[PDB]
Enzyme design. Sequence first.
Site, PDB file in Angstrom:
ATOM      1  N   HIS B  51      28.226  31.424  81.086  1.00 59.36           N
ATOM      2  CA  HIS B  51      29.104  30.419  81.697  1.00 59.36           C
ATOM      3  C   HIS B  51      30.083  29.786  80.717  1.00 59.36           C
ATOM      4  CE1 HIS B  51      26.213  30.691  84.965  1.00 59.36           C
ATOM      5  NE2 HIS B  51      25.253  30.343  84.123  1.00 59.36           N
ATOM      6  N   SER B  74      32.327  35.021  81.322  1.00 61.44           N
ATOM      7  CA  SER B  74      31.370  34.186  82.038  1.00 61.44           C
ATOM      8  C   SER B  74      30.382  35.059  82.805  1.00 61.44           C
ATOM      9  CB  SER B  74      32.082  33.236  83.002  1.00 61.44           C
ATOM     10  OG  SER B  74      31.175  32.266  83.507  1.00 61.44           O
ATOM     11  N   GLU B 153      19.334  34.355  77.976  1.00 61.43           N
ATOM     12  CA  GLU B 153      19.306  32.910  78.196  1.00 61.43           C
ATOM     13  C   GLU B 153      18.356  32.473  79.310  1.00 61.43           C
ATOM     14  OE1 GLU B 153      21.006  28.830  77.551  1.00 61.43           O
ATOM     15  OE2 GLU B 153      20.682  30.658  76.390  1.00 61.43           O
ATOM     16  N   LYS B 183      13.978  25.351  75.249  1.00 62.21           N
ATOM     17  CA  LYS B 183      14.901  25.784  76.289  1.00 62.21           C
ATOM     18  C   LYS B 183      14.263  25.550  77.656  1.00 62.21           C
ATOM     19  CE  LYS B 183      17.655  28.315  78.985  1.00 62.21           C
ATOM     20  NZ  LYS B 183      17.389  28.631  80.450  1.00 62.21           N
ATOM     21  N   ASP B 187      16.312  22.336  79.143  1.00 61.29           N
ATOM     22  CA  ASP B 187      17.424  22.817  79.969  1.00 61.29           C
ATOM     23  C   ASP B 187      17.012  23.018  81.432  1.00 61.29           C
ATOM     24  OD1 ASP B 187      19.063  24.861  81.330  1.00 61.29           O
ATOM     25  OD2 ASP B 187      19.854  25.500  79.396  1.00 61.29           O
ATOM     26  N   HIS B 298      19.802  31.831  89.717  1.00 67.40           N
ATOM     27  CA  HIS B 298      20.876  32.528  89.013  1.00 67.40           C
ATOM     28  C   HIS B 298      21.817  33.286  89.953  1.00 67.40           C
ATOM     29  CE1 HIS B 298      22.972  34.084  85.595  1.00 67.40           C
ATOM     30  NE2 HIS B 298      22.999  35.256  86.209  1.00 67.40           N
ATOM     31  N   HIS B 348      24.894  21.716  83.078  1.00 66.42           N
ATOM     32  CA  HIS B 348      24.094  20.718  82.370  1.00 66.42           C
ATOM     33  C   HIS B 348      24.935  19.939  81.358  1.00 66.42           C
ATOM     34  CE1 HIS B 348      20.934  22.765  84.289  1.00 66.42           C
ATOM     35  NE2 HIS B 348      20.392  23.410  83.267  1.00 66.42           N
ATOM     36  N   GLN B 360      19.889  30.045  70.877  1.00 66.02           N
ATOM     37  CA  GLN B 360      20.708  31.254  70.933  1.00 66.02           C
ATOM     38  C   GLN B 360      21.230  31.633  69.548  1.00 66.02           C
ATOM     39  OE1 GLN B 360      21.420  33.682  72.778  1.00 66.02           O
ATOM     40  NE2 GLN B 360      20.875  33.123  74.889  1.00 66.02           N
TER      41      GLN B 360
HETATM   42  N1  LIG Z   1      21.148  26.365  87.531  1.00 59.06           N
HETATM   43  C1  LIG Z   1      20.765  26.309  86.265  1.00 59.06           C
HETATM   44  O1  LIG Z   1      21.349  25.606  85.434  1.00 59.06           O
HETATM   45  C2  LIG Z   1      19.584  27.133  85.854  1.00 59.06           C
HETATM   46  C3  LIG Z   1      18.886  26.902  84.680  1.00 59.06           C
HETATM   47  C4  LIG Z   1      17.807  27.701  84.359  1.00 59.06           C
HETATM   48  C5  LIG Z   1      17.425  28.725  85.199  1.00 59.06           C
HETATM   49  N2  LIG Z   1      18.127  28.967  86.351  1.00 59.06           N
HETATM   50  C6  LIG Z   1      17.718  30.037  87.276  1.00 59.06           C
HETATM   51  O2  LIG Z   1      16.956  29.418  88.305  1.00 59.06           O
HETATM   52  C7  LIG Z   1      15.942  30.325  88.779  1.00 59.06           C
HETATM   53  C8  LIG Z   1      14.582  29.692  88.632  1.00 59.06           C
HETATM   54  O3  LIG Z   1      14.323  29.494  87.236  1.00 59.06           O
HETATM   55  P1  LIG Z   1      12.927  28.911  86.755  1.00 59.06           P
HETATM   56  O4  LIG Z   1      12.970  28.758  85.279  1.00 59.06           O
HETATM   57  O5  LIG Z   1      12.577  27.721  87.567  1.00 59.06           O
HETATM   58  O6  LIG Z   1      11.941  30.100  87.141  1.00 59.06           O
HETATM   59  P2  LIG Z   1      10.375  30.021  87.389  1.00 59.06           P
HETATM   60  O7  LIG Z   1       9.821  31.393  87.453  1.00 59.06           O
HETATM   61  O8  LIG Z   1       9.819  29.067  86.395  1.00 59.06           O
HETATM   62  O9  LIG Z   1      10.331  29.340  88.827  1.00 59.06           O
HETATM   63  C9  LIG Z   1      10.626  30.093  90.012  1.00 59.06           C
HETATM   64  C10 LIG Z   1       9.564  29.763  91.025  1.00 59.06           C
HETATM   65  O10 LIG Z   1       9.937  30.302  92.313  1.00 59.06           O
HETATM   66  C11 LIG Z   1       8.755  30.642  92.984  1.00 59.06           C
HETATM   67  N3  LIG Z   1       9.080  31.579  94.047  1.00 59.06           N
HETATM   68  C12 LIG Z   1       9.396  32.906  93.918  1.00 59.06           C
HETATM   69  N4  LIG Z   1       9.650  33.489  95.060  1.00 59.06           N
HETATM   70  C13 LIG Z   1       9.501  32.482  95.999  1.00 59.06           C
HETATM   71  C14 LIG Z   1       9.636  32.462  97.398  1.00 59.06           C
HETATM   72  N5  LIG Z   1       9.959  33.528  98.123  1.00 59.06           N
HETATM   73  N6  LIG Z   1       9.416  31.288  98.029  1.00 59.06           N
HETATM   74  C15 LIG Z   1       9.081  30.220  97.299  1.00 59.06           C
HETATM   75  N7  LIG Z   1       8.921  30.125  95.987  1.00 59.06           N
HETATM   76  C16 LIG Z   1       9.148  31.299  95.386  1.00 59.06           C
HETATM   77  C17 LIG Z   1       7.836  31.214  91.914  1.00 59.06           C
HETATM   78  O11 LIG Z   1       6.482  31.142  92.300  1.00 59.06           O
HETATM   79  C18 LIG Z   1       8.171  30.330  90.705  1.00 59.06           C
HETATM   80  O12 LIG Z   1       7.210  29.301  90.523  1.00 59.06           O
HETATM   81  C19 LIG Z   1      16.165  31.622  87.992  1.00 59.06           C
HETATM   82  O13 LIG Z   1      17.054  32.470  88.699  1.00 59.06           O
HETATM   83  C20 LIG Z   1      16.814  31.127  86.696  1.00 59.06           C
HETATM   84  O14 LIG Z   1      17.542  32.160  86.057  1.00 59.06           O
HETATM   85  C21 LIG Z   1      19.189  28.166  86.690  1.00 59.06           C
HETATM   86  N1  LIG Z   2      26.937  23.098  80.895  1.00 59.69           N
HETATM   87  C1  LIG Z   2      26.502  24.375  80.838  1.00 59.69           C
HETATM   88  N2  LIG Z   2      27.127  25.236  80.008  1.00 59.69           N
HETATM   89  C2  LIG Z   2      26.702  26.504  79.957  1.00 59.69           C
HETATM   90  N3  LIG Z   2      25.701  27.087  80.618  1.00 59.69           N
HETATM   91  C3  LIG Z   2      25.098  26.217  81.428  1.00 59.69           C
HETATM   92  N4  LIG Z   2      24.023  26.456  82.257  1.00 59.69           N
HETATM   93  C4  LIG Z   2      23.762  25.271  82.877  1.00 59.69           C
HETATM   94  N5  LIG Z   2      24.561  24.297  82.514  1.00 59.69           N
HETATM   95  C5  LIG Z   2      25.414  24.881  81.597  1.00 59.69           C
END
Ligand SMILES: NC(=O)c1ccc[n+]([C@@H]2O[C@H](COP(=O)([O-])OP(=O)(O)OC[C@H]3O[C@@H](n4cnc5c(N)ncnc54)[C@H](O)[C@@H]3O)[C@@H](O)[C@H]2O)c1
Ligand SMILES: Nc1ncnc2[nH]cnc12
Lengths: 427, 427
Positions: B51, B74, B153, B183, B187, B298, B348, B360
Amino acid sequence: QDYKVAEISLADWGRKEIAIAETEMPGLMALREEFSAKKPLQGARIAGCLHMTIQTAVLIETLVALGAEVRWSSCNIFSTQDHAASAIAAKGIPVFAWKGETEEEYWWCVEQTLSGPNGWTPNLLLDDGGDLTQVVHQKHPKLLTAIKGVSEETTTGVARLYEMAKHGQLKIPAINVNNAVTKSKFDNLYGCRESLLDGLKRATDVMIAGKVALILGYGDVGKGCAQALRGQGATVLVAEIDPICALQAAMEGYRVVTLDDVAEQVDIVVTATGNYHVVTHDHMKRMRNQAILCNIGHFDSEIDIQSLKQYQWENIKPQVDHVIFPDGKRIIILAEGRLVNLGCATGHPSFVMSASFTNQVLAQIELFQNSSQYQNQVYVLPKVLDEKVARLHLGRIGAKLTQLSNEQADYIGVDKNGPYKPDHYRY
Amino acid sequence: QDYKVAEISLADWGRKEIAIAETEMPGLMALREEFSAKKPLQGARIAGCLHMTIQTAVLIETLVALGAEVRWSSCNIFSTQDHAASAIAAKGIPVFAWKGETEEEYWWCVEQTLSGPNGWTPNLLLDDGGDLTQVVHQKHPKLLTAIKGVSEETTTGVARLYEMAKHGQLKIPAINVNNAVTKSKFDNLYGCRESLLDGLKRATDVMIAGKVALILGYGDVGKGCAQALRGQGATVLVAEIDPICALQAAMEGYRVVTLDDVAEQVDIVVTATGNYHVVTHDHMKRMRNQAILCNIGHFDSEIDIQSLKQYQWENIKPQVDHVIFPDGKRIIILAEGRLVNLGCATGHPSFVMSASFTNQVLAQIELFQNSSQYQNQVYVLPKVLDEKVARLHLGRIGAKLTQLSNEQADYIGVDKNGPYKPDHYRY
Ligand SMILES: NC(=O)c1ccc[n+]([C@@H]2O[C@H](COP(=O)([O-])OP(=O)(O)OC[C@H]3O[C@@H](n4cnc5c(N)ncnc54)[C@H](O)[C@@H]3O)[C@@H](O)[C@H]2O)c1
Ligand SMILES: Nc1ncnc2[nH]cnc12
Ligand SMILES: NC(=O)c1ccc[n+]([C@@H]2O[C@H](COP(=O)([O-])OP(=O)(O)OC[C@H]3O[C@@H](n4cnc5c(N)ncnc54)[C@H](O)[C@@H]3O)[C@@H](O)[C@H]2O)c1
Ligand SMILES: Nc1ncnc2[nH]cnc12
């Protein structure tokens, strides 16, 4: 009488509260339903050293229902619930435990667990804190040959096992029950979140709201203690030696400080470190009048209680004392520095103890059946059993699990029936 | 011009916000102070897919200050901050990124990272989600020989690496940055605790208080999302497939339910599963008028967006759309199901991204110097580096660490300088 308890006539009260606790402990009751007919612990002879509470009585009767013979002691001089011990003794189960033991009585009770009538000796140990493991290794090396293994309940006991193993002192396999996820992340955290408050409130009429409270240690126990006091309106300070745990505390809004700096500023001090002399004489000398000092870690050595021996201790009520300093300042010490939630209250509630104790039963089954597969090292139970423990507790609190479809299980790389997380996932 | 951005004249704004972010990112600035003179990444050629935010600009300039050459894209079509991309492009760093890419443009941008002028090719990959890793393995196998490794990441990217390794498809070493404690536990948890609200509030004028909000998934991201909404007065429901995570949610007071059961009852739905089609057409058909649907996992495939293709999409404002069903009911979909915190807000905040991005940089140094020591498997950085990352962030938020005495370090079995926890400690 192959037991020693304070008052056997308390047994009826103990049975009444055991009946209630069973309805809060679905993991243990599920193991009875699954295993009581097959009796997988028939032939198991378990020496147990673990707080003799109502919840532990349900654990003991689960082990017995599965075929085990046990001999029991408490792992703390103040943690026994006498009516729970009496209920166990009335069943004819050897138990050596009462609230308010002397140190000599404490170790005598442990010793009674190692030999019974008619040449009874244990082939299994169930320990909480490492004292039973110590006695057997250091005083009864002949017993070690017949011991299939030990399952250990708490963080301090596991620390002691790690150090034994590092130095070649561990002579039996050990199952680390503390670090089942359904133990460490539930009992240590949510249990203390409730039972620290219980101990503080039963001991004194001190209000939490508005107080400055210092928690020493921000591991699983300290995290639960901090949430407990913060929710009740205290300003919560945290001390830590670990920069990752310190950063966690800061990100929850707690100021991270040292007791060396803040001793004069605190109203309540809770030691949760598992370490040695984190509260010293000079800390206590600097504390405000009527400050409350307690320990929720395993051993009273978190506080240098010895340094107070020449001061007048004025008892307030059982397990609540004033220590009177020469300038007239008083501090309130709870349970002489012993585990406050079990010494001034009744320990964790039944539901979370069921999760811990279901892990204990599974560990004893695994050691009794398969100890030959293990070396003299520390092990944890597999994740599928950890998940099983959680599954057994979902119904009581009304949680409904979603089921993966085939494509969803494939998408994240798991079996539909688990395990659902990588081996080192931290939850 | 060896770059492609929306508007290069935004660079001055980007520089101004980068200057502010540096003061919130002490880990990255500390690595510059420690390493910019020795230049440990001199000779590193990093293809990056992550990103393109202001925070990532600080990461990029840290890599460059340590001697690396990079080419950047990105990992999401909506997550770029155009003024951050322009600031990087104005420095002469090749960056191919703008907010609102088409899918064809997205993959074109990734491709531009793999070859530069004068025969430039990467010898390192820095990935967030696994798309860059996929492109290289599946479309450019000749590049693989020269790639020393990839640092990944996010949880979904690591899941993809595990499945590649299981099937013998992983042809380079991989460092799992997601599962540094500093992380995953910061994060993913505290970052989303703030940035989910950011995305929701910027997108709509929906109040959180009083709403029924359903979080799908209770891992690190879902845990942070639940705390965020609960603190703002929502009734929070949680869905889970994992019984341990479900039990955690229940013990925090959330009812654990299935979307199959509650679709008609919810005001806000947040997908945080990392899984496939957890929100289906029939779920969306059952949702109340003006219900808000978003994804913080993701990939947009958490929602079956395709099933809405024949309905009228009426745009409200950028990345906020109404989907109009044939009976007239409307749902509000955020960022077409793409990452809501980065698509409708800015991701974030800087402080927690510093912790992620310090990991990283350390991973890239380790791969560049020592990739010969690794096989084609997934690895994590050692705990002493995890602790170092935490240490570097304590000063900014005023946390003061306690120092172990010799006897206290011995008592718990650690070195005074760490590491302080067993390898599999869960924090
Ligand atoms: N938006 C962001 O800034 C950000 C940051 C970190 C990770 N992510 C992404 O968010 C997602 C979750 O990350 P995480 O670290 O929490 O993963 P995680 O594995 O810790 O948590 C995911 C959870 O989803 C549950 N799950 C799976 N399938 C399911 C279903 N069908 N119904 C209900 N629950 C279900 C699992 O049991 C697990 O506990 C990933 O895709 C990760 O890459 C996003
Ligand atoms: N501010 C940020 N910059 C880059 N990657 C991110 N993932 C979640 N938040 C972010
Ligand atoms: N009272 C109960 O019901 C109960 C339940 C579980 C565990 N325990 C006991 O509580 C103690 C803590 O258990 P845990 O699971 O939280 O362990 P833990 O290792 O998870 O947490 C202990 C923390 O104390 C910190 N620490 C160590 N020395 C310190 C010092 N000098 N100053 C400040 N912080 C210091 C460590 O960095 C660590 O983070 C252990 O003795 C354990 O056996 C009690
Ligand atoms: N109620 C309880 N019973 C047994 N051991 C405990 N440890 C903490 N609480 C307990």
